[PDB]
Amino acid sequence: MQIFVKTLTGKTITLEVEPSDTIENVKAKIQDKEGIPPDQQRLIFAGKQLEDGRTLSDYNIQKESTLHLVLRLRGG
Amino acid sequence: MQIFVKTLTGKTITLEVEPSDTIENVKAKIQDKEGIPPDQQRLIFAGKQLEDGRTLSDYNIQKESTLHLVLRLRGG
Amino acid sequence: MQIFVKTLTGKTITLEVEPSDTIENVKAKIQDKEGIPPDQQRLIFAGKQLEDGRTLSDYNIQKESTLHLVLRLRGG
Amino acid sequence: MQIFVKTLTGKTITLEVEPSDTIENVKAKIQDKEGIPPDQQRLIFAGKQLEDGRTLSDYNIQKESTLHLVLRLRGG
Amino acid sequence: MQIFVKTLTGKTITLEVEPSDTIENVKAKIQDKEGIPPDQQRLIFAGKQLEDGRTLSDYNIQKESTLHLVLRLRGG
Amino acid sequence: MQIFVKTLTGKTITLEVEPSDTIENVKAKIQDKEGIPPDQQRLIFAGKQLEDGRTLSDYNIQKESTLHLVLRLRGG
């Protein structure tokens, strides 16, 4: 299914995910598409910081949902 | 000379640079310190988007100058 | 009641609506106020893409809620 | 506990709060740290405008949540 | 010549233009292709908000240049 | 001379100023009207972030010019 991922300045991309993906899986998909390492990524939905081991379904994130990506800004 | 690079989450770093340094050299220092791939960094100074292939002197970047660093999240 | 509509740049407007208004109603108000064709509008609340046939009530959108507008650069 | 407060431009700060803090108390903490008068503050969580007399725990706002701040201005 | 008009949703609009074309001419093409009235478009090049009656050559917009297009709703 | 100061919420502030007025003078006038401290104000004109100690004339700001005012929270 399609979701959207938005940065702090409003830049928005699409991403293909499944409801059973863990948040860590989603970050890996973001790495495939954009080259951002998963340990540099923080994901947010509806104000809530998302935890790596939980799934999209766990959070009730459905198709065409928008997640927010913020960088963690850690050493290379 | 020392310059400042700021982010929207409030992490500021200093870099030690020369006027002859290229923008791509600055971006490499930023990936080393903050983990952002260079192709995903956008730097703004004096209203301009700083481009690889130019030097700091081309934008009149000087000691104490402050650059604004944001995530590009390029493509769609 | 008043609601707020936020765009990707952060520019925000206010609309006067009713809880029983449909998502398509709201897109028609945006067209009336600003000239944006409804078929070019995606509306989002709390991360969820909102469906045309449903109402603000269905989504628990109360007074002084903030919705997001993103353009569908072509979307029929 | 820590929360994030994001502005219209994307600029984000962290704030130390407690679950039992009222929304008014949180606006006052923002005033202490940033000088913005509480009267000039709207706070939003998952699209909902937060009401001064209720607590963060009433809204189920947990650690590492992101709130949005928008200024209430006059304009003449 | 071609210029590239980029959007916050990552859609790049390629336009066939002449240096003698005005910003109004560019906005008119965007209205026809994407449905956004010119009054609700803002175009950025070199940090400047581009004025309707000025030409591409006046802004030193050359072949293969990139412009940033954002939705600009108007009003409170 | 009159200048106009626009905000992302659509509240436009009209100021009576002189070309020799410094940006810090202007920001104090905005604080008088709206309550936002100067360190929390950024003004954009011609793509530049206007510097406190410089004059309106330094940036070629003249009668009926429009400035963009945005909230700038400080720190991490």
| Beta bridge pairs of residue E69 | E43
> Hey, what long-range contacts does B30-34 have (CB within 8 A, 24 or more apart)?
B30/B5, B30/B69, B31/A76, B32/A75, B32/A76, B33/A75, B33/A76, B34/A71, B34/A73, B34/A74, B34/A75, B34/A76, B34/B7, B34/B69
Residue linked to tokens 């493509």: B75
Expt. technique: X-ray
CA proximity to D69, closest of D32, D18, D26: D26
Tokens representing residue F56 in the block:
């309106």
Residue C75 contacts E where some CB pair is shorter than 8 Å: no
* Distance to chain C for E29, nearest Cα, Å: 13
Contact (Cβ atoms closer than 8 angstroms) between residue D7 and residue F9? no
Return all residues near C24 (Cβ < 8 A) that are at least 6 apart: C38, C52, C53
- Reported resolution, Å: 1.5
Of residues D7, D8, D47, nearest to C45 (C-beta): D47
**Alpha-helix residue ranges (DSSP H) falling in chain F:** 23-34
Task: Name the amino acid, one letter, at E69.
Answer: L
The residue type at E6: K
Give residue limits of the domains in chain C. 1-76
CB contact under 8 A, A7 and B73: yes
Determine the residue among D12, D31, D34 to mutate to test chain F binding: the one whose Cβ has the most chain F Cβ atoms within 10 Å: D34
Q: Which residues of E touch C11 (CB under 8 A)?
A: 71-73
Reading the block at residue B44, the tokens are 């703004």
